[PDB]
Paper text:
Recently, the novel multifunctional S-adenosyl-1-methionine (SAM)-dependent enzyme [name], located in the PKS-NRPS gene cluster for leporin biosynthesis, was characterized in [name]. [name] is considered as a SAM-dependent methyltransferase that can catalyze stereoselective dehydration via three pericyclic transformational processes: intramolecular Diels-Alder and hetero-Diels-Alder reactions and a retro-Claisen rearrangement. The overall structure was found to be largely similar to that of SAM-dependent enzymes,28–31 exhibiting a core α/β fold of alternating β strands (β1–β7) and α helices (α1–α19). This structure exhibiting α helices and β sheets comprises an all-helix amino-terminal domain (NTD), a carboxy-terminal domain including a substrate-binding site, and a SAM-binding site, which is formed by a seven-stranded β sheet rounded with five helices.
To elucidate the mechanism of [name] action, we first determined the structure of SAM/MTA-bound [name] at a high resolution of 1.7 Å. Two molecules of [name] observed in an asymmetric crystal unit form the homodimer, which is primarily mediated by the NTD; specifically, the α1 and α2 segments of one subunit interact with those of another subunit to form interlocking fingers, and α3 is involved in the formation of the hind surface of the active site. As determined from the strong electron density, SAM binds to one side of the [name] pocket and maintains the catalytic domain in the active state through interaction networks. The adenosine rings and amino acids of SAM interact with Phe276 and Asn275 via π–π interaction and salt bonding, respectively. O4 of the ribose and the tail amide of SAM form a pair of hydrogen bonds with the main chain of Gly227. Specifically, a hydrogen bond forms between the S+-CH3 moiety and the main chain of Leu292. Collectively, these interactions result in the coordination of SAM in an extended confirmation. Additional electron density was observed in the pocket of the [name] density map, located opposite the SAM-binding site. As MTA could be detected via HPLC analysis of the purified proteins compared with the reference standard of SAM and MTA, we modeled MTA in the electron-dense cluster and found it likely to be coordinated in the hydrophobic site, with some residues displaying significant conformational changes upon MTA binding. MTA probably mimics the substrate binding at the active site, thereby blocking the entry of a native substrate as a competitive inhibitor, thereby decreasing [name] activity.
Residue numbers in the entry:
A (entry chain A), B (entry chain B): 1 to 387
Write the structure that this text describes.
Amino acid sequence: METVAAIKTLIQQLAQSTDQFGRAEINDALRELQYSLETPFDTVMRMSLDTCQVAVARIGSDLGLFKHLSQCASPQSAEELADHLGCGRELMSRLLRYMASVRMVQQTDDIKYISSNITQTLAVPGLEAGMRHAFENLWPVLMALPDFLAERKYPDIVDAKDTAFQKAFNTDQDCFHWLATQPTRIANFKVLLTDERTPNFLSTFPLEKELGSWSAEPEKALFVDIGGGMGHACIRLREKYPNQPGRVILQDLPPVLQAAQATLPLSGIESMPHNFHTPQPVQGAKFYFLRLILRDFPDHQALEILQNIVPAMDAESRIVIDDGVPPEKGARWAETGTDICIMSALGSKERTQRQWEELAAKAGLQLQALYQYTWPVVNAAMVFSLQ
Amino acid sequence: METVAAIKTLIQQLAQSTDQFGRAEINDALRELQYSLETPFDTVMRMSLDTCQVAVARIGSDLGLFKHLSQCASPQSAEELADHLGCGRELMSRLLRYMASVRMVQQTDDIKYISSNITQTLAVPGLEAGMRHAFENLWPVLMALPDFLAERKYPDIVDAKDTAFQKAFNTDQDCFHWLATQPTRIANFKVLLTDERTPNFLSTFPLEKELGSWSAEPEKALFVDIGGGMGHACIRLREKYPNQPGRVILQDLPPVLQAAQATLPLSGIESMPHNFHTPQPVQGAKFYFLRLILRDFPDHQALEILQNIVPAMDAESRIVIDDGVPPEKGARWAETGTDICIMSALGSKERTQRQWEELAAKAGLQLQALYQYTWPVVNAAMVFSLQ
Ligand SMILES: C[S@@+](CC[C@H](N)C(=O)[O-])C[C@H]1O[C@@H](n2cnc3c(N)ncnc32)[C@H](O)[C@@H]1O
Ligand SMILES: C[S@@+](CC[C@H](N)C(=O)[O-])C[C@H]1O[C@@H](n2cnc3c(N)ncnc32)[C@H](O)[C@@H]1O
Ligand SMILES: CSC[C@H]1O[C@@H](n2cnc3c(N)ncnc32)[C@H](O)[C@@H]1O
Ligand SMILES: CSC[C@H]1O[C@@H](n2cnc3c(N)ncnc32)[C@H](O)[C@@H]1O
């Protein structure tokens, strides 16, 4: 209709007028409008059928469909794609019709297919690995959660070894120990670590202000990236602040450090094997950095991780927790759905600012500053000192 | 910000101004805009987390939360709901924060909780049963589909006994036969049958034109509702055309007829046990009516269902197929996701108009008229005659 076409034009123009945070606000508003305007039948159909997207994306990934379509220079028929990818022709046609209906691909007026933005996204290895993680790891845990809670009379989940994960995968191990026995899941996780989120904390972190008159002499450490994965934070730090002296150290387990060597700069960033359940070896660093680490642990274990760092700190040292800080009320779906998932798989939780401060106070830490860098979903670098 | 509030105001006014079909078009446009404006990370987070809605709706149903909240006269704290419903207080608080973020409930400015439109929807028994069906029946089949297809080198699914269902539930039975052996699932399906879709075919079906000079004597049947469930079509027919002569007959299996007695009118509608895989007993009826029946069967079995009716027809008899008629191109998510689901569970498929005509021609039937009654997703009463 002319009205819906005009709605689309105006929302597209408003989205172009603003920045990425304004666009995120607009998208959340579109979701709220959808939910408020759907009929009861629509609500049930949406909940029933939006499930299809993850399974169908998993199939397209298995087939290599999104990568292939992303590199195509002209629209492709369903028969061409089926023959190229080794898929039944009718199966491929039905899959593509569904995918086009949810913009996973685009369907042309002559019933051929081209890449959409979502096609290109699912072709990126790290983002593809995120979707595959949702299918193979998250889905079974969420499928097990309702009956787990029912059988246990709805307990408050507090223990990584006693949550829905153990029911879903028929094991008594916690998720992290179980994963070490699953090579294909490990391989997918290694690809998942190559995804770099944007924006990052350096977009708003006032580094020179927080540094003050800290001296890197004689040979002190500026930045210790604890569980840093591929070291993206270290790389971006050296990129934005190339002249700031001090050691920059990536700490992780040996297999992921080995994976990180391929893309690490030739010099300037150390790779130090370190298990963050053991005392922090680097003494007196300016910043001990924990990005998306503590969210994966219940309070008692997250506390242990902080307690292992505290003895290494001097008066100028800071622990920087870079993580989600959802609000007391009005939290968005992308910071509450995470909470349900990490509850069900890891026994952990999202933490408000007050909850972060309580946890850190148990380690003897005090919040000095908080630097938000995403909106409306809150990710922030929280700077803690001793006392 | 102010912009988001203005978008909501204007879209709400436009939605109020139009009818249900215009609102459905607007909602589809809002979904398309959301998908087109999300970031790559947003896409993966959405696919990862929208899954949570079905699991959390199942938990809320298990707790009786939506029915309870729907009958509350004031906002309720999370502690009050937890204590009343027998749920851990922190678990209840986290569940409610997530539900509020996806409008499954509403959160007030003082962090209490009231019903939303979706709360009320999930409190309705038939719609609740739809959500429970999505969780317990659809989700396992979709979880099994990618590896089923991979192990079988991506076959065209054509057989109700050889699809993802058999892997999901570790059985050689087809879905309907297996479900008949599962009493709790049967009970849920009986509640699901009490949901009546709106609008229905009588909103556009020119009954008097199709009847012509047809005579109901001697004791002939006007309308035979084959697999009619609770008999809603019979009830609405008698309601809209109370003076039209001719028997009106609800045909289904005995347990469903028994369930239907509670809500059936005291006179005017016959309850006749009949299995639609067997020859049709009522001879020379004007309309043999099949609503949302044939979509659940692959072509050879749907053909058998029609062939069991054809010998009962005289020259004035018509078979009326009331079902989805998705377009050749540009089909919507609510008529393609259905296709993927019924492929994976039942071996069946959605059918375009041309595919319906091919199938019916195998039974000796010819399309006379097609009366659409929903938009933009196509449901239509297709009228077939002999020859
Ligand atoms: C969320 S991932 C990567 C987060 C990373 N800081 C980032 O934002 O780029 C968590 C990281 O913690 C690492 N890790 C898990 N257990 C660890 C342990 N016991 N000691 C050190 N690192 C660990 C993983 O190998 C992984 O690289
Ligand atoms: C989609 S449901 C209800 C459809 C119904 N026409 C309506 O629109 O409400 C399918 C119906 O077919 C019935 N059914 C399933 N197998 C049947 C059979 N073999 N013979 C007769 N009815 C059957 C079920 O009991 C159910 O009522
Ligand atoms: C976008 S990739 C991260 C997504 O997967 C979920 N997730 C990530 N890592 C884990 C993990 N180790 N265990 C359980 N869920 C996870 C998070 O809720 C998020 O939605
Ligand atoms: C509102 S319920 C409609 C849903 O029922 C689903 N469905 C799949 N198999 C069956 C079945 N055997 N019985 C009833 N509904 C089913 C379809 O996928 C559709 O999304």
